[PDB]
């Protein structure tokens, strides 16, 4: 009987990264994968806490209106959802994009020096490899610059599902069936991590 926070990274005025021609953004793909994953977890008897359920950002219009302020308030509000939830786990869904288009693959991250989160990340990365792309040999990497993963007291991981910078992967990431495959991989990773202890 677990309670899991799923965070579709971005929303509202904040797209994420973009494709070369700026047709495709992180917002919508993150939300799509997160809602697929929500369905997997809830139909298995877990309770899901969402930071966002739709295309919105966690800020109020006070017309101070600094885009950097809007972004910062969004992050603070997501942090409070983590703090006040009494959840067992936090999973953030993003995508990556670099200037070099040759990079591809799903990549998981965990907050530096948190062992439980490293184990969870490894479970999810193994499932992302086995289910989505056996070609992918990426290893889990620590981070210390993701605010939402710092100092949470629960296992916390970020998943960058693929690169919008890569044309083949971008085309895959806009596909509802590929999105479901990724959600399946993440869900299985969570389930293995939870079955050990």
């Amino acid at each position: 009987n677990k309670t899991i926070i799923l965070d579709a990274g971005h929303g509202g005025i904040d797209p994420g990264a973009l494709n070369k021609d700026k047709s495709t953004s992180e917002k919508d793909i993150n939300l799509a994968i997160t809602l697929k994953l929500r369905e997997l977890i809830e139909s298995s008897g877990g309770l899901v806490i969402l930071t966002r359920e739709d295309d919105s950002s966690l800020y109020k219009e006070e017309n101070n209106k600094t885009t950097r302020q809007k972004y910062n308030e969004n992050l603070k509000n997501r942090k409070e959802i983590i703090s006040n939830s009494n959840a067992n786990m936090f999973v953030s869904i993003h995508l990556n994009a670099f200037e070099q288009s040759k990079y591809y693959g799903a990549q998981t991250f965990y907050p530096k020096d948190k062992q439980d989160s490293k184990e969870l990340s490894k479970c999810i990365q193994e499932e992302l490899k086995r289910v989505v792309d056996k070609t992918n040999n990426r290893e889990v990497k620590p981070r210390d610059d993701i605010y939402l993963l710092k100092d949470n007291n629960i296992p916390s991981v970020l998943i960058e599902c693929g690169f919008l910078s890569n044309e083949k992967e971008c085309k895959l990431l806009t596909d509802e069936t590929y999105q479901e495959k990724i959600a399946w991989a993440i869900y299985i990773g969570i389930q293995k991590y939870l079955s050990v202890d």
Binding site: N1, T3, S44, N86, W184
Partner: protein, 170 residues
């Protein structure tokens, strides 16, 4: 004095009843095997337990249709046939939300209430999870089939609501 000797059929039917109600048995089996040469002897231990098997398969939300979870023993099978994936996981130990036999059977501390044609059964969920606090089952007082089940958070809000439709048993 003592009863009369049982006939063939009385002893046989007693035996049928005894082995039918059996939920566990265990014995030592000394086996002699005789091929075309010397016999050979073996000793085995035979263990029998009657065990529960639950299958939950999702039909409605199209994304999940045909996905399933199967609870067998120490094992759990999680199946996504859309990509022909089967994952086996260990069972640590209600097995799922909607599982009512063996928690509403094996009575403990429990609130029982007879209200508006329903047997209402309430238990606390151990672990003091804010979200999975109390489990309430509504049973039809005439059919004794379960109608509804609610998992309530610590504030009494249903977080999970199971409505049972088309209930049949043997």
């Amino acid at each position: 004095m003592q009863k009369r000797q049982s006939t063939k059929e009385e002893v046989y039917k007693d035996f049928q009843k005894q082995i039918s109600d059996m939920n566990y048995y265990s014995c030592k089996a000394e086996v002699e095997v005789v091929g075309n040469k010397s016999p050979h002897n073996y000793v085995l231990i035979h263990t029998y337990k009657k065990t529960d098997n639950y299958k939950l398969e999702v039909i409605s939300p199209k994304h999940l249709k045909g996905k399933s979870i199967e609870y067998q023993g120490d094992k759990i099978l999680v199946k996504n046939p859309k990509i022909s994936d089967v994952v086996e996981l260990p069972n640590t130990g209600y097995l799922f939300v909607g599982d009512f036999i063996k928690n509403y059977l094996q009575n403990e501390e429990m609130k029982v209430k007879l209200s508006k044609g329903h047997l209402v059964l309430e238990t606390f969920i151990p672990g003091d999870n804010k979200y999975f606090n109390k489990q309430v089952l509504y049973v039809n007082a005439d059919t004794k089939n379960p109608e509804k089940m609610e998992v309530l958070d610590k504030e009494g809000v249903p977080r999970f609501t199971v409505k049972y439709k088309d209930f049949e048993y043997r």
